[PDB]
Amino acid sequence: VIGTPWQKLDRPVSEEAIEGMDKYWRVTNYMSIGQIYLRSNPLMKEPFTRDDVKHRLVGHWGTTPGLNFLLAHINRLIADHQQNTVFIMGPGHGGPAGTSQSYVDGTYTEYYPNITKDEAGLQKFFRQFSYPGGIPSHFAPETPGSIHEGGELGYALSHAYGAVMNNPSLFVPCIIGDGEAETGPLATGWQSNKLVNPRTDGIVLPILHLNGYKIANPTILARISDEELHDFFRGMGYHPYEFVAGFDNEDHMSIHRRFAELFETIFDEICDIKAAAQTDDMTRPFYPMLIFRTPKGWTCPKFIDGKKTEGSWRAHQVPLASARDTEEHFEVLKGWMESYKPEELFNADGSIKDDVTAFMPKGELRIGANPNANGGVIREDLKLPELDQYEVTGVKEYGHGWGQVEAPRALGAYCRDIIKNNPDSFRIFGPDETASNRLNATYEVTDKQWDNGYLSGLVDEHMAVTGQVTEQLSEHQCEGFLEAYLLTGRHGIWSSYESFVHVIDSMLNQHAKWLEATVREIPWRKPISSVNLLVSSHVWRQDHNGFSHQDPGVTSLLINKTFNNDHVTNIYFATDANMLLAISEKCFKSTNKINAIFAGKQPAPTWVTLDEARAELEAGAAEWKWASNAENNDEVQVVLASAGDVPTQELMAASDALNKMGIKFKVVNVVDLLKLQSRENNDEALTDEEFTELFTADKPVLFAYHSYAQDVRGLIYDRPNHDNFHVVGYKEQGSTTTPFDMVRVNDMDRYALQAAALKLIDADKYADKIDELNAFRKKAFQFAVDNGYDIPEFTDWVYPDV
Amino acid sequence: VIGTPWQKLDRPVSEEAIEGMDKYWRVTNYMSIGQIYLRSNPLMKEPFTRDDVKHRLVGHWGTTPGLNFLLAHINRLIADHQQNTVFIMGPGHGGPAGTSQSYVDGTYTEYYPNITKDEAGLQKFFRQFSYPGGIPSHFAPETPGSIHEGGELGYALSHAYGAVMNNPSLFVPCIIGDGEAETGPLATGWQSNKLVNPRTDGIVLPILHLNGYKIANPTILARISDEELHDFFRGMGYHPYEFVAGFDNEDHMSIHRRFAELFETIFDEICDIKAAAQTDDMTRPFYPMLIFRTPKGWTCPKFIDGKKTEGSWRAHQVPLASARDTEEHFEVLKGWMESYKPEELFNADGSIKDDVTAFMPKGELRIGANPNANGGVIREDLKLPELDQYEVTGVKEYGHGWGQVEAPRALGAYCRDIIKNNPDSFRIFGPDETASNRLNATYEVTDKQWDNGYLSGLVDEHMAVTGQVTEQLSEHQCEGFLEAYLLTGRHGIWSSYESFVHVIDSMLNQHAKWLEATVREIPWRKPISSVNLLVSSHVWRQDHNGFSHQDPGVTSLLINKTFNNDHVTNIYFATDANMLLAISEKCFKSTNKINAIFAGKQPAPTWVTLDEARAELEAGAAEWKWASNAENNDEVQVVLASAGDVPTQELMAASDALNKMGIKFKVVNVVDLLKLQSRENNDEALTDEEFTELFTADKPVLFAYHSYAQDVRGLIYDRPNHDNFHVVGYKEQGSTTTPFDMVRVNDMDRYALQAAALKLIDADKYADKIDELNAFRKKAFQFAVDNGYDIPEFTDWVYPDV
Ligand SMILES: CC(=O)c1sc(CCOP(=O)(O)OP(=O)(O)O)c(C)[n+]1Cc1cnc(C)nc1N
Ligand SMILES: CC(=O)c1sc(CCOP(=O)(O)OP(=O)(O)O)c(C)[n+]1Cc1cnc(C)nc1N
Ligand SMILES: [Mg+2]
Ligand SMILES: [Mg+2]
Ligand code: NA
């Protein structure tokens, strides 16, 4: 248990705490300006001149003094209440507030011993910000106290609410830009309070950083009427409180006392909600939120060159852009740094004075030290059930290609038992698709968590105010909740229709970037559990939907995060349920990855046993010898290679036909896609020798690929024999139609695969047979048109091993 | 002018109109069930049996009777008020409501003559829905009256509000799923009413289709308290009205009269707002919105197999899934179809009776016929200014590589004058980045349109309640507004930081799919203007930001929509401002495309004259002979090829060094990326002969690519000499740093490009020189570390032609 969660003070904030908060705010403002502007001389010792100013002024001042103000008050609150707290910096371009916070709390020097608490350390701290060989502009994973960089705006609230799930002692004050709140993902993020429970989860306090402006415009929320703004927050289930400061001559000590009093009222309300929830955990409370309305750039010069800067979008990036080049900008910068009176904040040796930090929290309550902001220090491996009990044993009892299994049901049973064994640290998210993607065996041990109105057991099934599945029709919510759940040390999976995974392409990019920086150069940030995404209801079998639901292209995006041997991204094609099981075990053990797990949910053959699945997965691609009819690679006339359940089924049927014609071939299944890249691009891929062994040195290879052929073509560009691969992938064809028709129109069906294999082998010799196969595809299509279902010869085919 | 816009009735809805609306609702419900369930016998003529039921039951009943109800009332409103109207079907899986609407209004038979108004036509209409060789499950572009398919949910409101921009006579009732409203893009879509003007734009009426459920869950909005729901809509600037029906025994005629009365109150309020806006166009009104709360699946069987179906998520997809296989489901289906009393709705010949449609609008007011729902019939070519006046003439006067131009400023001036010449049909959208991406010369002739509070001319600049630029910090808004603006026949452009274009990857996918279906098989849907996206502030020069802002990967997504010779996607690399001008002219003339226009906004050399730009763009890739020093291709030791402003600059400097060493090479610039594909994949690409002429038959080619190397590798897979290309692209390296450092760490800098060219030519011979270049890159990096700016030898280099 960290601290004493949810305790009220029952006395006023002390005057010593007010004095310390004002010094915090002045020293963090001063050092934020130092990080942006100063390459040397951080205490302005004589002579302080333009030569001390950075040659390239980069950074964002506008948000920063508002963040520094809130962080003074959040620090005071954590110390007085001993409250387990992680904050979210929505405007993550306010990096200097976050580095300053860590430098003040002592964690920065603890993690970065060269950046010491004295004048030499402070000089290095100023220079390094946004500087070559230094540190980032944003609140990056290398900053103690960050679980959210806030570079690509919009995810502040999903991360805040995922952090508090199953974390009942955790308080998250979530600072949201008012520009940020105009994004789609942030606007739906407010609604998360219908999906958390005040007893079993922790508490988010949204703080709208309503500074009136984004980059070059006012914000929507800052210019609507007060009555609309309050109605908006009340309508989303909050009790809105509003603070307004900095727009008149009120002295800063008075402002601190008024804010401290308000923040105590708000926290007392949060403690009352927490206490009440021990008895009534079914009534959704109106959680407080805070409208924090202060001038953008607060405390910078009001006008610069006759233009209003404090209280304007003009304060957004770097005021006084000429501070190094003109004595006029320099004199302004000097007056501004001096206005904080650093001679009262730092000792002669350059260390921040003790009376600046006596009010601060200590130990693991510090924002920089709390282990929820470095959740791999809290993370424990899952207690996983034995995989063998889930195996589809039909392959062993009856043969390769047996049965009509819906593959994700086996993952569902495995998930059900993982939740049983790990009942408060493994969650499933879904955008109203958990049952549709066949993971609903989980409901046998838990419910979907819904903290909003109930009506009747005639409609409400498998839903309760607490549970370990969460659904909302938003891929951004599901991805953001899960990411923060992992970042705070827990585990999970989500599932999406494949075409709609693209809604969160950019979130996958940012989380991959977080992982890249971490595996490269942040070894104190310990490994977290991986994002596991079941990519299902795929391009080939969207029976009730049509062409909008046909886009397997998240493969292509994921390929753009496969560099430097970071190994933070995996693309797996689950050939059947036994393979899905073997892939899911590996993913649930893995850390510091995004794992995209492709599996069809339609009834489909099972090809491999679980033991075979375990070996083949490890290799990445495997010959299926029981399906090949060639002696050795020299006898092979063509290599039949597939990735994905549907291409494999069609390839298998084509193999059966090619066997009966007396054609010699081998069958290769590909599960771990990026293991096709060369060793030069991927030090864990198949070696050239293993790659040649599978694909031959010079035989043609027909490769039936689940997604866009482009992906495989680009991955295998420097591989031996790559000029002989003919990759058949999805090619933007299809509609609402029968299963045969969907493969037919992308040349993916068994008949077209058999034809392509014959064309690769000898086009002239097989000219007639190819015509005949192409005519059968027309006949089969006409059959479907006339009759309403596919031709029995297609649907009724079972691999001859069965 | 279509109809008589914004006219009140000032009498009650007639009883004849109520009777006609009830018959509409019954016949469209009946035919919706017919489309889902029936392969033959649409009038249930003796014998009606299981054999008439489809073998594959696919489709979505739950949303559909609510849509059919609203469409009866929207049709009545259009007819009585003669109101120019396009609706948006948010729940686009209710395709049968949209096809039924067109079949009733007569447009379906007008566009599809085989689907006649009689029993034979009705049989074909039922069978074809969601059927092989038939039509889609959703409200697809092939349905008259659609500008929004609603497959990937969330974009209903951005499309509605973009439709009404500069369209002051247009009314858009926008039907939003209540599941849909849990998405991010929909949640921010409500806020658009701060960005439209009630005088110069038309009016959206959001209708929340609050049927209580999504697929397998209730919805957030349906289960919060009524007071929260109303406060929510009032807080977003609406006057909420709520209708509740279908939950008790109220007869359907009574329900129609109550709704008609309410819908007249709402429309009268919209007419009052429109009238008032002729005098006060600065006060933002509270626009009506409608909460429409009815049971999901309304009018289907209340219970099926003991499970509540009407008023449940269970009604979502296909009730009575056994209707063909069991007499029990069949008897239920039969009673349900009979409950609509089709013997009163159709004549003996199977035509829908005249008294079913006497209340309907006629001519171009019909929802299926209105030209705003087929805007290429309204679209006129832009009156474009002459391009030559914008040319950067520095190249002609001083030489190739001259000056420090910020390329998008020339596009800004060109846009400024396009708006001048087309002052109400060309708009610019930006997610608070218009000025940041340097398109702010447009503000010389128009303002950013902002219909929310003003404070002071000290902060409000270039903003007014009407104008042709719109900004909101949401890529989903900018993309959705623009798409509908084009779909209703107008023109525009938007700009985004390149990394954040990924927020709307999935919207680009859907619009590409809309374009694919249209160019393939919908010739009555005439061409619309293209989506033009300035992709700027790119990976190499995000000076104030860092690694979160470094992701040029939208190239890779766009490559997945380049099939079948649809030619609906273009990727252009603007080498400099003259090239950007030549690309922008072509894009502004083009139709039925998405055009991604890559240009850097940093100060940069101009390489080509405008006449050269015009020729090279047409070819797609061009030798720059004035930069090559080889005689012919046989003399070439290496081909120096680049795409993108920054790779080209570095390649050019490498060429200068390689020239001074006595190395023989040619320079090739690539502008129109997909023209590198083979003719087999792209019938408008470079032929093999032209490709060999540029890239040689067998010399090494160093290709410095703006984005991920993977893209170029996969595109050129079947090209002559492709095994000799070495593609250098962005490889997930970089941070907040100097311009040299960002290229350095991706091996993209001039020194590394010169080294790679030497390695390709003779690794042994040049071993020492390569070491030396690699050491200079270290020295240059250390310089930046020590000094705060890049080494003068790097920054000060100008191409020797200047
Ligand atoms: C850094 C960057 O690229 C910023 S900061 C910013 C304004 C944010 O204003 P906000 O009111 O949220 O913050 P504050 O006033 O500074 O506190 C924008 C549009 N951008 C570009 C941008 C665009 N779109 C998205 C999704 N994310 C980002 N970061
Ligand atoms: C068709 C499909 O793939 C549907 S329909 C649906 C429920 C929509 O409920 P809503 O309340 O909006 O509509 P209604 O009750 O039927 O009127 C979902 C989750 N899906 C999957 C889905 C997921 N995510 C996104 C972005 N879009 C879609 N279409
Ligand atoms: Mg702001
Ligand atoms: Mg609904
Ligand atoms: Na090759």
Residue A190 per-residue DSSP state: G
Length reported for chain B: 802
Label residue B669 exposed, middle or buried (CB < 10 Å: 0-12, 13-18, 19+).
buried
State the DSSP string of B236-270. Answer: TTEEEEEEE-SSSS--HHHHHHHHHHHHHHHHHHH
Largest CA distance in chain A: 95
The crossing angle, in degrees rounded to 10, of helices A505-521 and A475-487 is 20
Close Cβ partners of B206 (under 8 Å, ≥ 6 residues apart):
B157, B160, B174, B176, B190, B238, B289, B290
Answer whether B553 touches A (CB < 8 Å).
Answer: yes
The CA R_g of chain B, rounded to the nearest whole Å, is: 30
SS3 of residue A18 by DSSP: helix
Distance of CA A371 to the CA centre of its chain: 19
Residue that has been written with the tokens 């709140």 in this structure: A181
* Contact (CB, 8 A) for A172 and A461: no
- Report residue A162: phi and psi, to 5°: -65, -35
Contact call for A452 and B223, based on CB within 8 A: yes
Helix (H, G, I), strand (E, B) or coil at B226: helix
Name which of B718, B802, B699 is nearest B760 in CA terms. B699
Residue A136 per-residue DSSP state = -
Does A716 contact B at CB distance below 8 Å? no
The span from the CA of A146 to the CA of A152, in Å, is: 15
d(CA B318, CA B61): 6
Task: Determine contact, residues B462/B559, Cβ cutoff 8 Å.
Answer: no
At A359, is the secondary structure helix, strand, or coil?
coil
Axis crossing angle, helix A475-487 with helix A156-164, rounded to the nearest 10: 50
Q: Which atom of ligand 1 is nearest to the CA of A152?
A: 27
Strands (E) located in A537-625: 569-573, 594-598, 603-606, 621-623
User: Strand A621-623 and strand A665-670: pairing?
Assistant: antiparallel
Domain B1-386: which topology? Rossmann fold (3.40.50)
Give every CB contact of residue B457 below 8 A, 6+ residues apart in sequence.
none
Token pair listed for A798: 């079972």
Query: Which residue is closest to B37 within chain A, CA to CA?
Result: A788
Contacts of A500 in chain B (CB under 8 A): 152, 506
- Resolution (angstroms) stands at 1.9
Breaks (C-N over 2.5 A) in chain B follow: none
A457 touches chain B (CB under 8 A): no
Could you check whether A1-386 and A621-802 share the same CATH topology?
yes
Nearest beta carbon to residue A448 from set B138, B217, B435: B217
Collapsing DSSP to helix, strand or coil, B174 comes out as strand
Query: For residue B150, how far is its CA from the centre of ligand 2 (angstroms)?
Result: 9
Asked whether B411 and B534 are in contact (CB, 8 A), the reply is: yes
Residue in A317, A506, A510 nearest the CB of B544: A317
Quote the crossing angle between the two packed helices A95-105 and A64-81, to the nearest 10°: 30
Task: Dig out the tokens for B681 from the structure.
Answer: 């994949």
Distance CA A110, CA A75 (A): 18
| Contacts of residue B460, Cβ cutoff 8 Å, sequence gap at least 6 | A218, B450, B454
| Whole-number Cα distances in Å, B313 to A14, B213, B757 | 55, 5, 63
d(CA A540, CA A543) in angstroms, rounded, equals: 8
Token pair recorded at residue B211:
């049927």
Q: Whole-angstrom Cα distance, residue A302 to residue A749?
A: 70
CB A507 within 8 A of CB A149: no
- Say whether residue B247 is in contact with chain A using an 8 A CB cutoff: no
SS3 state of residue B665: strand
Q: Are strands A88-89 and B531-536 parallel, antiparallel or unpaired?
A: unpaired
Start-to-end Cα distance in chain B = 56
Q: How many Å apart are CA A638 and CA A625, to the nearest integer?
A: 14
A459:B505 CB<8 A: no
Size of interface A-B (CB pairs under 8 A): 403
Using CA atoms, how far apart are residues A601 and A574, in angstroms rounded to an integer?
Answer: 11
B492, containing H or E segment: strand B491-497
Peptide bond preceding B371 in cis form (omega within 30 of 0):
no
CATH class of the A621-802 domain in this structure: alpha beta
β B203-209/B171-177 pair status: parallel
Rg of the Cα atoms in chain A:
30
Neighbours of A602 (CB within 10 A): 19
Choose the closest CB to B220 out of A194, A454, A561. Answer: A194
Best substitution site from A68, A70, A93 to test ligand 1's pocket, by max atoms within 8 Å of Cβ? A93
CB atoms near residue A633 (< 10 Å)? 18
* Beta-carbon count within 10 A of B610 CB: 22
DSSP A488: T
CB-CB contact of A728 with A703 (8 Å) = yes
d(CA B460, CA B142): 45
Concatenate the DSSP letters of all residues of B631-661 into one string.
SSTTT-SEEEEEESHHHHHHHHHHHHHHHHT
Closest CA–CA distance from residue A677 to any residue of chain B (Å): 11
B182 lines ligand 2 (CB under 6 A): no
Rounded to whole angstroms, how far apart are CA atoms B510 and B514?
6
> 3-state DSSP call for residue A436?
coil
- Calculate the CA B802 to chain-centre distance: 42
A553: CA distance to ligand 5 center in Å? Answer: 24
Are A76 and A260 in contact, with CB atoms under 8 Å apart?
Answer: yes
Range 595-624 of B in CB contact (< 8 A) with A = none
Instruction: Classify strands B569-573 and B531-536 as parallel, antiparallel or unpaired.
Output: unpaired
Q: Furthest-apart CA pair in chain B: how many Å? A: 95
Q: Are A715 and A559 in contact (CB under 8 A)?
A: yes
Q: Does B331 touch chain A (CB under 8 A)?
A: no
Query: What's the CA gap between A741 and A576, in Å, rounded?
Result: 22
Ligand 2 atom, smallest distance to B316 CA: 16
Decide: residue A110, CB within 10 A, 0-12 exposed, 13-18 middle, 19+ buried.
middle
* Euclidean distance between CA atoms A32 and A99, whole angstroms: 8
3-state secondary structure of A611: helix
Give every CB contact of residue A697 below 8 A, 6+ residues apart in sequence.
A633, A720, A721
Identify whether the C-beta of residue A422 lies closer than 8 Å to the C-beta of residue A382. Answer: yes
Measure the CA–CA gap between A483 and A165, rounded to whole angstroms.
Answer: 12
- Residue ranges around ligand 1 (CB below 6 Å): A 62-63, 91, 93, 152-154, 177-180, 183, 209, 211, 213-215, 219, 296, 316; B 431-432, 473, 497, 500, 503, 545, 549
Neighbours of A75 (CB within 10 A): 27
Distance CA A654, CA B754 (A): 49
Which site among B502, B677, B678 would you substitute to test the A interface, given the most A Cβ atoms closer than 10 Å to its Cβ?
B502
* Rounded distance between C-alpha atoms, residue A527 and residue A533, angstroms: 18
Task: Tell me which residue has tokens 């001679």.
Answer: A343
For the beta carbon of residue B533, count every other beta carbon within 10 angstroms: 26
To the nearest 10 degrees (0 to 180), the angle between helices A15-37 and A64-81 is 140
**Token pair for A216:** 């070059």
Please give the helix or strand (H or E) that residue B536 lies within, else none: strand B531-536
CA distance B410 to B414: 6
For the beta sheet containing A569-573, the strands, ordered from the edge strand earlier in sequence to the opposite edge, are A463-464, A448-449, A469-471, A426-430, A491-497, A531-536, A594-598, A569-573
Region at B41 (left for phi over 0; alpha for psi -120 to 50; beta for the rest): left
DSSP, res B46: S
Which superfamily is assigned to A403-620 in CATH? Thiamin diphosphate (ThDP)-binding fold, Pyr/PP domains (3.40.50.970)
The single-letter DSSP state of residue A685 is: S
Q: Establish if A510 touches chain B: CB-CB under 8 angstroms.
A: yes
Interface membership of A242 toward B (CB under 8 Å): no
Round to the nearest angstrom and report the end-to-end CA distance of chain A: 56
> Residue A233 and residue B119: Cα distance in Å, rounded?
54
Burial label, A437 (beta-carbon count in 10 A; 0-12, 13-18, 19+): buried
Residues B74 and B209: beta-carbon distance below 8 Å: no
Q: The tokens of B342 are what?
A: 């089709």
Q: Are B270 and B288 in contact (CB under 8 A)?
A: yes
Ligand 1 atom with least separation from CA of A180: 12
Closest by alpha carbon to A217, among B306, B464, B197, B341? B464
| Cβ within 8 Å, pair A732-B516 | yes
Domain ranges for chain A, please list them. Answer: 1-386, 403-620, 621-802
Q: Which residue has the tokens 């800098």?
A: B749
